[PDB]
Ligand binder design. Structure first.
Ligand SMILES: Cc1cc2nc3c(=O)[nH]c(=O)nc-3n(C[C@H](O)[C@H](O)[C@H](O)COP(=O)(O)OP(=O)(O)OC[C@H]3O[C@@H](n4cnc5c(N)ncnc54)[C@H](O)[C@@H]3O)c2cc1C
Ligand SMILES: Cc1cc2nc3c(=O)[nH]c(=O)nc-3n(C[C@H](O)[C@H](O)[C@H](O)COP(=O)(O)OP(=O)(O)OC[C@H]3O[C@@H](n4cnc5c(N)ncnc54)[C@H](O)[C@@H]3O)c2cc1C
Ligand SMILES: Cc1ncc(C[n+]2c([C@@](C)(O)OO)sc(CCOP(=O)(O)OP(=O)(O)O)c2C)c(N)n1
Ligand SMILES: Cc1ncc(C[n+]2c([C@@](C)(O)OO)sc(CCOP(=O)(O)OP(=O)(O)O)c2C)c(N)n1
Ligand SMILES: Cc1ncc(C[n+]2c([C@@](C)(O)OO)sc(CCOP(=O)(O)OP(=O)(O)O)c2C)c(N)n1
Ligand SMILES: COc1cc(OC)nc(NC(=O)NS(=O)(=O)N(C)S(C)(=O)=O)n1
Ligand SMILES: COc1cc(OC)nc(NC(=O)NS(=O)(=O)N(C)S(C)(=O)=O)n1
Ligand SMILES: [Mg+2]
Ligand SMILES: [Mg+2]
Ligand SMILES: [Mg+2]
Ligand SMILES: [Mg+2]
Ligand SMILES: [Mg+2]
Lengths: 582, 582, 287
């Protein structure tokens, strides 16, 4: 039974209805930045004793913090901004949440309804702007529509395929007095009629029948299995099928397990891409067949019967036509198949040891490799030390670039929602704010931001947010003085012609620029720099043991390349296995 | 005669056609951030010996730098970004350039044409997103359309009412070989037919006739007069009409002149708002009648015959119907009226000394005032010292907030394009990157960023850009540890209830947080902090005399309020003249 | 009701539009491509592996042949009044089923689909997705131009025919052998049928005649054809129906045959909107 701060017959401001609408949704943390259009909302937030606001230093850091809050907990992330410039700073976060299917609810202030369309002070048509980069958006035109729209916003953002939902609230609606009606029915008739239903037994028995008829099955797990870690693990025990995860599906099946093929795709392991290339049954659970995994669609799984399970009917058959399809929750599809695989266990006699040994041979001949040059710190080795010292139980958020791939390859994630990274949009500056949202949603957890010197500096202002909110956010900065991912593509396909990829100072060429330690010192965050490989283990241990925030500037040779690499539009026969920029 | 780097019959990449198309437009400086979708453009930029790229540390800093480059020189500002997250970071700059009518050309990379709409890697419909926040945008669908679209983009961005134009270029178009045709005719038939024509003599003679019949005339000058400083000054000599400028029109008529009423509007001087309130002829030259100037439209210039000259026919009569209107360039309208005012000089016998003395009395009784508390530095006084030590010849870029208003009130700008500020959108984090673009376009000029502690930290990463490019950018940081503008509205209309406006550390409440000096030290920029009013003059002098970049952390008491203040929707009778937060 | 449609069947969906596969119902096996090529590929497998598969569904066909004989398409004849179903059945016989049929929208559209045996595709031109009235007469114009040596017949309704009646001038000027089998029931029959079933026969602007002269055929469609110089005739008795349709076919050039039908007829069978197979209506009309 919800206990309101107002009487059921007492009129209250629309902003007070908005905050209470969040309280009735279970919202405990918002990321709001104040402004003229949203001052009424911020005043109403102070009256709430259950909703905590984490003030960022940039609205892009506020929406990215809402993503990490959502990616690391399954709950929806709520960010609030003002009209005009405050709303336009959320654009990168909204498009990022849409491509990665992150439940998010963004509330933006707006000019009064009478001033909309008049080029008013700090007015931008944020609904027209964000319609193509959000799952759905609203423009509240009456104070009585607030309880319904907020309920519809959280329902659309969390149900089906999750995504961001923006709610634009004009200022005159926030100030208008009204008595809210919390019993209104949602006006989503076509959406609810198209919601997926529990999977039929005829579809599940046909999948189990294809498993027994197959000799080389491979599991294709992605971001749709973040809530099916137990169901997927039970499915692997009953089948013994090796698991290949996407960049979004890391942690769904433990990377340290013997049946794990780790990541597949452009920068996936050689044995994971080998398994899909020479498979006869591809179980695509919670994936969307991105070109980062398939490359050339004509050659991707060219000899496999494709079984695609997805909660979005628009994804089934988009880039590749499957043989058997199941539109619904992969969590329920696994539960239904586990019952069939257990009763009919001895009837099926499932054993793929011959196919697994074919992959174990490929795993031992082409494993993830990194070369150590003298005392220079290998970035792959540094992340491998972080795995050991944290026992693989740390929540990892990353930026975008070479460090993002090495953090995915050389860290064994035991559970999903430990791996927070921008995969669909690939937005730099995501690592640091996402670690803020993850640390708030998981206070007793080890949160480490494996960031790059280019991605870290984009939202470096959020270091002040970490200090003020006293969050134990660790920053494992892999500094290579370059935009490493773009630098790698210059060495491979452009004759190493540098085109504005060096991030240091050309005057003092051999000086670490910028001095990231002074960035942490400016915000009162203890920091240290490590350059020699021998001092690396003690430095990372000091970062973890030191209470509160900590930044570790790890210097790495910039000539390193992420391996292996399948060029864009290439096949498995075009995989690059060796080479760098020396 | 343009000299190309390729033979007229030699095929070249589409990216090389794009860069040469910029060279043929006179482009010398671009602000490009590399990415997978725009690597071909960056490779082609290195082959250009005339186009210099200023690499920012954030695309929002790149587009804001393109604004300051344009606002301080009249030339169009060119910023380049990659697809997906790089393009979405330009959104705040595009909407800011549209509301302030800043000529800007944004070039964004895009996924290959075959992959558009497939939720590809780093794909966002940037044309669908930015259609409502740009003057016009394009999606290049063929390599042969590059010479025409670039010519149309620069024409639309600089002609008529200036604005931002976005050009989305897919990657396959950048790589395709072709022979460019630089003789293509622009396909803008309806736009050129609607372009304003030179003003007719019948309209100009009717304006001059209303000037002689009026007794209390007031000039209403705005951002449309940035290229008419000489024509406007000549017009004032022949009429003796006092000049009231908007936040965008500062510098058009010198603030130090005796005939200048300084700024009008919400935070405009009392005597400027008094002149418009009690006028019989309002000469609105290059303005758009924003609610920040009018307030309540029914009471704004309620006794004046309104003469509105504007180059956009959609602005004439939008918020207020004028008596006489002239659709065209205010530069030509002033030239035509100056000829009539000089030949018919003794015939008209123009003299408004009685009306000017009525305003001089109001100027002496209600001037711009600030109170000095002990040795605490008044933010108004610090800007007044910067005016004296720079002789008013410095290019000033500001953020948004209280410091933005004090930099407009207490600095006498002698020429337009010395004042770079976000007025229409009012985007924080604009001051520092705009100073970068202004310093590049004006290397031998004094560029000072009067920023606030909240606005400065949003794009603090651009300090690395200032050091690498070795730009003599001065940062006069008015630090009040608060979001001062929002804090002021809390004291006035919300009983001083703080709602997430304090930017410091609540644990160490009386400690300056963050330590902005260490931000400059991280990027190798000399910095210093001044707290006592006596040491203020020597500190600002050290900032100016020290070559290269410099940051001056000026500590100010946060209880200061921007005065005077006309509340939203109020009239001249509701102006607040005294009060603060003590 | 999608939940009950083919509730016990493995659905195999072949379609050239990937957006249609799995939209309203999820199939077990899907093939995105041209069904023409999919049939060619399956025919080769079915012929080589013919004796290996031993395909025989005579037991399932006999189960349907029993249902076909107990519930066939039925129409009732009332005295000498012309049954609209019978008139279309006569047109099938006199044209040997080789005529190109274009229809409007309504009851006449359904009877032209039920009681005519089309031997080849592209003989049946009708608005199904949008269901636009006034489609029959102009579509017969385009079909007669694309197929000059073919028998083109417009099975139109009095409401649909009048919407684009101006195209009769186009038929005469272009000299097109367009036959108009007008099933005149003086009503918007399809909307009238739904009034009798679900609205207690409360007429809501469905009568197309003249209420002053209630028992007079209004409008006189014969004078519409006469205005455009098209020979026309009206038939009311069932005995004169066979000779009237034969005169329409044998007369060269355009021809309009005003076939008067009792308006109380209903299109059967009928499954109500959102219903299942257990809700099929098999008998009943408006008498
Ligand atoms: C620099 C860089 C390099 C990259 N390289 C790689 C790479 O080498 N390999 C790689 O895999 N990725 C890589 N990516 C990431 C990438 O572009 C995509 O995010 C990824 O390839 C696709 O993730 P996904 O298949 O799991 O689909 P997601 O984006 O995770 O979407 C989930 C899918 O499952 C479905 N779904 C969601 N919820 C449910 C549910 N409850 N039940 C059933 N279905 C559900 C959704 O409809 C959707 O189709 C890279 C990214 C970057 C920035
Ligand atoms: C915190 C804050 C407080 C503010 N308070 C104030 C305030 O107290 N006072 C104030 O004035 N502003 C204030 N503003 C700024 C503000 O919101 C608007 O930018 C400003 O009020 C309107 O500027 P403008 O009238 O010059 O029109 P602009 O935005 O400068 O547009 C120029 C106008 O002239 C026309 N034009 C352009 N070129 C030509 C040409 N060549 N010939 C003829 N016409 C042309 C255009 O069509 C357009 O209508 C504030 C902003 C902020 C962020
Ligand atoms: C907002 C934004 N702007 C530009 C981007 C285009 N990209 C990249 C990519 C993969 O998206 O290329 O398509 S990666 C990259 C450079 C990474 O700098 P680092 O942080 O130092 O990481 P590292 O460990 O050194 O490699 C750029 C510039 C991007 N994604 N986001
Ligand atoms: C991207 C962005 N986000 C939020 C904004 C909403 N606003 C403001 C306003 C006027 O737009 O209110 O409508 S001003 C302001 C706070 C100014 O912090 P400061 O830099 O310290 O300046 P000061 O000298 O102390 O006053 C905010 C939060 C904004 N405009 N831009
Ligand atoms: C342009 C147009 N306007 C109105 C229509 C709505 N409908 C119908 C329907 C099925 O679409 O109802 O949804 S059928 C119909 C009446 C048919 O008049 P008839 O020609 O005399 O045929 P009959 O042999 O008597 O039954 C109407 C009014 C329509 N489809 N098209
Ligand atoms: C807190 O700082 C400021 C500053 C400022 O101008 C200096 N004005 C305001 N307030 C309004 O503008 N109210 S309003 O007129 O209803 N708007 C158009 S809105 C919805 O807020 O964009 N707050
Ligand atoms: C430079 O860093 C990277 C990284 C990376 O993935 C790790 N891929 C690429 N290149 C492409 O993606 N080419 S592409 O396939 O034509 N694109 C979809 S696009 C237009 O570039 O977005 N560059
Ligand atoms: Mg930033
Ligand atoms: Mg780097
Ligand atoms: Mg401040
Ligand atoms: Mg489909
Ligand atoms: Mg009818």
């Amino acid at each position: 039974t919800f206990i309101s701060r107002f009487a059921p017959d007492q009129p209250r401001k629309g902003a007070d209805i908005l905050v209470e609408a969040l309280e009735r949704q279970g919202v405990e943390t918002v990321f709001a930045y104040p402004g003229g259009a949203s001052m009424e909302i911020h005043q109403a937030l102070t009256r709430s004793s259950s909703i905590r606001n984490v003030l960022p230093r940039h609205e892009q850091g506020g929406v990215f913090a809402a993503e990490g809050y959502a990616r690391s907990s399954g709950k929806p992330g709520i960010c609030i901004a003002t009209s005009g410039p405050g709303a336009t700073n959320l654009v990168s976060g909204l498009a990022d949440a849409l491509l990665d299917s992150v439940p998010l609810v963004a509330i933006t202030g707006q000019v009064p309804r009478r001033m909309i369309g008049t080029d008013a002070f700090q007015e931008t048509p944020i609904v027209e702007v964000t319609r193509s980069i959000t799952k759905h958006n609203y423009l509240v035109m009456d104070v009585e529509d607030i309880p319904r729209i907020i309920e519809e916003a959280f329902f659309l953002a969390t149900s089906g395929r999750p995504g961001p939902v923006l709610v634009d609230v004009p200022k005159d609606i926030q100030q208008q007095l009204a008595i809210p009606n919390w019993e209104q029915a949602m006006r989503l008739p076509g959406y609810m009629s198209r919601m997926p239903k529990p999977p039929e037994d005829s579809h599940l028995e046909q999948i189990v029948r294809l498993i027994s008829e197959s000799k080389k099955p491979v599991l294709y797990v992605g971001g749709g299995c973040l809530n099916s870690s137990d169901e997927l693990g039970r499915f692997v025990e009953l089948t013994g099928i090796p698991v290949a995860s996407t960049l979004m599906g890391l942690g769904s099946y433990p990377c340290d397990d013997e049946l794990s093929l780790h990541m597949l795709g452009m920068h996936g392991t050689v044995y994971a891409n080998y398994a899909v290339e020479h498979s006869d049954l591809l179980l695509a659970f919670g994936v969307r067949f991105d070109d980062r995994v398939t490359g050339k669609l004509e050659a991707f799984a060219s000899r496999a019967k494709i079984v695609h399970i997805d909660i979005d009917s628009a994804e089934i058959g988009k880039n590749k036509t499957p043989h058997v399809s199941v539109c619904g929750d992969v969590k329920l599809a696994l539960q239904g198949m586990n019952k069939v695989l257990e009763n009919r266990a001895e009837e099926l006699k499932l054993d793929f040891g011959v196919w697994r040994n074919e992959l174990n041979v490929q795993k031992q001949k082409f494993p993830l490799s990194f070369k150590t040059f003298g005392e220079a710190i290998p970035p792959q080795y540094a992340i491998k030390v972080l795995d050991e010292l944290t026992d693989g139980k740390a929540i990892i958020s990353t930026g975008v670039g070479q460090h993002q791939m090495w953090a995915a390859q050389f860290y064994n994630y035991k559970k999903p929602r430990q791996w927070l990274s921008s995969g669909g949009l690939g937005a730099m500056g995501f690592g640091l704010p996402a670690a803020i949202g993850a640390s708030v949603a998981n206070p007793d957890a080890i949160v480490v931001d494996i960031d790059g010197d280019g991605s870290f500096i984009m939202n470096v202002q959020e270091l002040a947010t970490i200090r003020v909110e006293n969050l134990p956010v660790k920053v494992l900065l892999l500094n290579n003085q370059h935009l490493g991912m773009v630098m790698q593509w210059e060495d491979r396909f452009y004759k190493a012609n540098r085109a504005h990829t060096f991030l240091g100072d050309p005057a003092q060429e051999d000086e670490i620029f910028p001095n990231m330690l002074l960035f942490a010192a400016a915000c009162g965050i203890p920091a240290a720099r490590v350059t020699k490989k021998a001092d690396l283990r003690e430095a990372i241990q000091t970062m973890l043991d030191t209470p509160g925030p900590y930044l570790l500037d790890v210097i790495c040779p910039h000539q390193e390349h992420v391996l292996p690499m399948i060029p864009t539009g290439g096949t498995f026969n075009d995989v690059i296995t060796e080479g760098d920029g020396r």
